[PDB]
Amino acid sequence: GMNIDEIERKIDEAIEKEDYETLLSLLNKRKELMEGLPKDKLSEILEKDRKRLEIIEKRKTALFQEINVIREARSSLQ
Amino acid sequence: GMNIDEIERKIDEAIEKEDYETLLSLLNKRKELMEGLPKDKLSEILEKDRKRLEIIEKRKTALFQEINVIREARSSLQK
Ligand SMILES: [Ca+2]
């Protein structure tokens, strides 16, 4: 078993490497440990998750920008 | 400026490197030359363009897959 702090560290690593499938699995592993945490640690993990979500939402808007440039190229190839 | 052969080569280089802004620019430069080309070079270019469309469409689909997994991660984060 990995401890909460060790999964927390892999979660941020996954996010940085833009490895979202691995992130998914870590969050699902973390889901088991969530119910037996003290309230202060839980609240800091949830606060941290807001910041994590800000990171991937910026990555998502960048993917949409790159998709759109390919749409321009596609029109220009046609 | 550059001739058609050099542009076509840089175009394939831009596709490989995911440099779609440079592709756009190169395609604009090519569109000026298109009118003057022989019918044989035009058809060569149209054929290449098909394969090129396949490559960037495959890459656009890959990006959407990333977006789709990202949406799942958000859900799992938003509990
Ligand atoms: Ca992975």
Automatic annotation (TrEMBL), chain B:
<feature type="binding site">
    <location>
        <position position="19"/>
    </location>
    <ligand>
        <name>Ca(2+)</name>
    </ligand>
</feature>
<protein>
    <recommendedName>
        <fullName>Flagellar protein FliT</fullName>
    </recommendedName>
</protein>
<dbReference type="GO" id="GO:0046872">
    <property type="term" value="F:metal ion binding"/>
</dbReference>
<keyword id="KW-0479">Metal-binding</keyword>
<keyword id="KW-0106">Calcium</keyword>
<feature type="binding site">
    <location>
        <position position="22"/>
    </location>
    <ligand>
        <name>Ca(2+)</name>
    </ligand>
</feature>
<dbReference type="InterPro" id="IPR037285">
    <property type="entry name" value="TM0693-like_sf"/>
</dbReference>
